[PDB]
Amino acid sequence: KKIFKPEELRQALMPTLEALYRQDPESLPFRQPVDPQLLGIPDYFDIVKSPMDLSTIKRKLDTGQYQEPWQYVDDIWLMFNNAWLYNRKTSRVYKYCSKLSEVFEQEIDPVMQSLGYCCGRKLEFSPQTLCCYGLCTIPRDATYYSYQNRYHFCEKCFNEESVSLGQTTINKEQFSKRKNDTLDPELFVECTECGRKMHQICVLHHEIIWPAGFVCDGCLKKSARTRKENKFSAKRLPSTRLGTFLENRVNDFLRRQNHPESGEVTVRVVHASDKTVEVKPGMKARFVDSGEMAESFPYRTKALFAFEEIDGVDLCFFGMHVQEYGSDCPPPNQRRVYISYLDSVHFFRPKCLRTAVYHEILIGYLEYVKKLGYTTGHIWACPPSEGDDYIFHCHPPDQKIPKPKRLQEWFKKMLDKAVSERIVHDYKDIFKQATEDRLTSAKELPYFEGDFWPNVLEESIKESGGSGSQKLYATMEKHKEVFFVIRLIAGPAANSLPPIVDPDPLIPCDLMDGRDAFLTLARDKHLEFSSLRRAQWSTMCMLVELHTQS
Ligand SMILES: C/C=C/C(=O)SCCNC(=O)CCNC(=O)[C@@H](O)C(C)(C)COP(=O)(O)OP(=O)(O)OC[C@H]1O[C@@H](n2cnc3c(N)ncnc32)[C@H](O)[C@@H]1OP(=O)(O)O
Ligand SMILES: [Zn+2]
Ligand SMILES: [Zn+2]
Ligand SMILES: [Zn+2]
Ligand SMILES: [Zn+2]
């Protein structure tokens, strides 16, 4: 419907082109088509297959060759990328190009908005971090070697003449040499009325939620219409006793604070299933085969998430998975909870209450399981490894990751509040707790899925040639600050408790059975949590998936 008259485009866009022209000397290298012979650059057309320059763009603009402004934008960016491709990162033309692109970004955005568009930005997704086979990492722009887009090797790892994969043998000549410089553009959706192309993420159009098609805000307002209601919301996910309890605690806290521009928080439990952790081969040979320790321990895993409405749209800002070992579970795991992992995306409003809200969620959770008859909570204060994510794929680059001391103090501050509220009786590091329990053997340590202690015990038994317990106190002392043991129910009352009965039903949801599936989904579908807009999109997609798979 909306056809842009060539004078309309010229009038609107020419000032953005002049802005580049008037950059001296930066503009000069880009004003005329590259003559490779005259400049003395022979291989230019071996690399650059679609040459572009300011004159060519000016001409297309003067002669009405563009039907819509993104075509102008694409040519501008082609010119820039041609120069960034051909010239060295350290060169003159490269840095000049970079300067022009900055001028362009600033110029183009408000112009495109004047023409009825979401924005004028050039948007591309973050490059994924590439592993090796033999646990190292390949960074962005570093040359590397790959086979079947599956087996990749860092350049140093490669030069040492046939590779083993899995176990078949592949000559080095069969590998691709390439740079990790590939970035996927953001996708557009077309307004079904005016025909304008908008960033799908800018407008948050999801085809399942609005199957009749995308209609831009401009077109809606002209006829005083509004979008059909999004029924795939966080609020409409099924309620649980636990979720309700946590969200009530949070919102009651927020109401007491009465900070300006506070929003309601929604907490939902999205997975609950029964699982078992098996004792690993070292500990099994040592204690299971002689009948001193159970071969495996049953637990219930749960996943829960907190959401806030920001700018009218759902935003998932906190996630946590827990392991719950009930009253039927054998010692040493009986009546214990362990936090598998928690994660957050730092967009909560108001900022000044963010930490407080996370603490309320954790304190609430401890309070809840205490009420059910769980006696003891367990936390391993372990920051994610460099450039890894616990739950949310691709964090904002300006969200800092706490180092261990800061994270330890954060847990201590939470627990101190829990103690002052008479929820937590007390808490101790693992070394002090073992001392208090008069622990003598490794078989007496709680044994959790994915935890530090099962792995270090394997290593210890093998290193010592058969002892599980020799250096155990020394190992606990050495790592003590990182391991919290939290007494919810103390003393004689902990010995005569009734069975634990959880009133909430099981909740099958394969997507949220541990962290891996949602990380995989997010990676495969470009669901990043790296900016407010991308997190809002990713939340919207996550919620559709949660609503439709169940
Ligand atoms: C076995 C499994 C165990 C676990 O999962 S334990 C939990 C581990 N999880 C994670 O760490 C997941 C990712 N982290 C989170 O989501 C974590 O934030 C989190 C989920 C705590 C939440 O942390 P908070 O936002 O409540 O607090 P932080 O310590 O992250 O940040 C507070 C503060 O410290 C600053 N900070 C944080 N790190 C640093 C550094 N490094 N240097 C300097 N300053 C720093 C940060 O910028 C902030 O500054 P201001 O708001 O501007 O005052
Ligand atoms: Zn946009
Ligand atoms: Zn390597
Ligand atoms: Zn429209
Ligand atoms: Zn404030």
Curated annotation (Swiss-Prot):
UniProt superkingdom: Eukaryota
In-chain residues carrying the UniProt-annotated modification N6-acetyllysine: K280, K417, K443, K471
Post-translational modifications: Acetylated on Lys at up to 17 positions by intermolecular autocatalysis. Sumoylated; sumoylation in the transcriptional repression domain (CRD1) mediates transcriptional repression. Desumoylated by SENP3 through the removal of SUMO2 and SUMO3.
GO BP terms, alphabetized: animal organ morphogenesis; apoptotic process; B cell differentiation; behavioral defense response; canonical NF-kappaB signal transduction; cellular response to L-leucine; cellular response to nutrient levels; cellular response to UV
Annotated phenotype, changing D343Y: Abolished acetyltransferase and acyltransferase activities. Abolishes autoacetylation. Does not interact with TFAP2A and inhibits transcriptional coactivation of TFAP2A by CITED2
GO molecular function: acetylation-dependent protein binding; acetyltransferase activity; acyltransferase activity; beta-catenin binding; chromatin binding; chromatin DNA binding; damaged DNA binding; DNA binding
Positions of the Bromo domain: 4-111
Substitution effect: E449R: 90% decrease in activity. 90% decrease in activity
Subcellular location(s) per record: Cytoplasm; Nucleus; Chromosome
Keyword set, alphabetical order: Acetylation, Acyltransferase, Biological rhythms, Bromodomain, Cell cycle, Chromosomal rearrangement, Chromosome, Citrullination, Cytoplasm, Disease variant, Host-virus interaction, Intellectual disability, Isopeptide bond, Metal-binding, Methylation, Nucleus, Phosphoprotein, Repeat, Transcription, Transcription regulation, Transferase, Ubl conjugation, Zinc, Zinc-finger
Function, as annotated: Functions as a histone acetyltransferase and regulates transcription via chromatin remodeling. Acetylates all four core histones in nucleosomes. Histone acetylation gives an epigenetic tag for transcriptional activation. Mediates acetylation of histone H3 at 'Lys-122' (H3K122ac), a modification that localizes at the surface of the histone octamer and stimulates transcription, possibly by promoting nucleosome instability. Mediates acetylation of histone H3 at 'Lys-18' and 'Lys-27' (H3K18ac and H3K27ac, respectively). (Microbial infection) In case of HIV-1 infection, it is recruited by the viral protein Tat. Regulates Tat's transactivating activity and may help inducing chromatin remodeling of proviral genes. Binds to and may be involved in the transforming capacity of the adenovirus E1A protein.
Protein name per UniProt: Histone acetyltransferase p300
Span of the entire protein shown here: 1046 to 1662 of 2414
